[PDB]
Amino acid sequence: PDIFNRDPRDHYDLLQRLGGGTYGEVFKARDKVSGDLVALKMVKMEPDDDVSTLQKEILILKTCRHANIVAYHGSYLWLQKLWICMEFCGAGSLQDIYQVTGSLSELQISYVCREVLQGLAYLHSQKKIHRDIKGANILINDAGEVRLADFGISAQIGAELARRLEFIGTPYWMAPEVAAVALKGGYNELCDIWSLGITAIELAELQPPLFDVHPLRVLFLMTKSGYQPPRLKEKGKWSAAFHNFIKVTLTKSPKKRPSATKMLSHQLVSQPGLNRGLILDLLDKLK
Ligand SMILES: COc1cc2c(cc1Nc1ncc3c(N)cc(=O)n(Cc4ccccc4C(F)(F)F)c3n1)CN(C)CC2
């Protein structure tokens, strides 16, 4: 991986701050030479972070190539800050969209779900796990296409890495099985299938299930043996294929939850007629 050792402002003009967090901030930028629009995610480094770890992580981003994953262009390391240059999606997230447009149509939701599963199937083929499939992390470009955003690299380096370690506290007395669960272990890639189920409900009802319930309470309720998976509120508004798509994605047992590849063969996402034009209608609603 070629982490360019220059200033990113030499090659790009920053145009607008899109969002931020403990990882850093993301800007809309324009290539001073190409004129192409790009997203520039700046991750604030820490002294104890090693240059070896970044390369490992930048190779992960470089190798990960799928049409439904936001494209990686390059990386820069300047003044103790890391900059990741990525594909730019001019319509923001689906959350940015449905907060203005309202609930999506079943056809639009199906197209989104098929596109996400295509990317999800690719990530799981590479033994990777998104971990945060949700409407706020599903990007849309002006062409009506779907791109998965990923904030994982920040959990392995920089300030987010520090804050997690700050919460775990001292690990020297910890048993090795507890250590595993702290490095995000204990589950499988099939949690992405569940999160897509809630996302479909989120796109249909403008909120995830139990959104108005306190986070702790919601956490207890899912660990109860008698928990019931959520469902769409208005049954009549949606077809049986959609209801079944929600039923099979929201399988409690991870050993019985179907894979992204199995879900790509589901009736809701395998129907002809699903294409970018469905979201082009949505982006027009916004206008
Ligand atoms: C019109 O364009 C945009 C309008 C808005 C957003 C995004 C873009 N466009 C874009 N395109 C490509 C990428 C990319 N490859 C990686 C990446 O992290 N982001 C940022 C992002 C991505 C997902 C969630 C949060 C965030 C953020 F951090 F910014 F808050 C990208 N954003 C985010 N809404 C909250 C506010 C409005």
User: Which tokens belong to 258?
Assistant: 């179907």
Q: Confirm whether residue 41 is marked as ligand binding.
A: yes
Sign of the torsion angle spanned by Cα atoms 184, 187, 189, 193: negative
Q: Which of 31, 96, 132, 281 is catalytic?
A: 132
What's the CA gap between 111 and 220, in Å, rounded? 33
Distances (CA, A) of 20 to 42, 136, 184, 190, 200: 9, 13, 23, 28, 25
Q: Is 40 helix (H, G, I), strand (E, B) or coil?
A: strand
Distance (Å, rounded) from C-alpha 11 to C-alpha 32? 6
End-to-end alpha-carbon separation of the chain, Å? 41
Under a CB-based contact definition with an 8 Å cutoff, are residues 229 and 251 in contact?
yes
What span, in angstroms and rounded, lies between the C-alpha atoms of 19 and 75? 19
* Annotation says 48 is catalytic: no
Helix (H) or strand (E) holding 78: strand 72-78
Question: Closest ligand 1 atom, CA of 86?
Answer: 15
Name residues whose C-beta falls within 8 Å of residue 105's C-beta, 6 or more positions apart in sequence: 278
231, two tokens: 């469902």
> Which of 16, 17, 26, 64 maximizes ligand 1 atoms within 8 Å of its Cβ, making it the mutation to test the pocket?
26
Report chain breaks in the chain, C–N > 2.5 Å, as residues after which they occur: none
Nearest residue CA, atom 35 of ligand 1? 19
Domains (range + CATH), the chain: 3-88 (3.30.200.20), 94-152+182-286 (1.10.510.10)
Residue 286: CB partners within 8 Å, gap ≥ 6?
A: 91, 97, 100, 101
* Angstrom resolution of this structure: 2.7
Q: How many angstroms separate the CA atoms of 208 and 200, rounded?
A: 9
202 labeled binding residue: no
Going by alpha carbons, the residue nearest to atom 3 of ligand 1 is 92
Please give the Cα distance from 180 to 246 (Å, whole number).
Answer: 31
Can you tell me the distance from the alpha carbon of 104 to that of 97, in angstroms, rounded to the nearest whole number? 10
Helix locations, 76-157, DSSP H: 94-101, 106-125, 153-156
Is residue 93 within 8 Å of residue 138, measured between CB atoms? yes
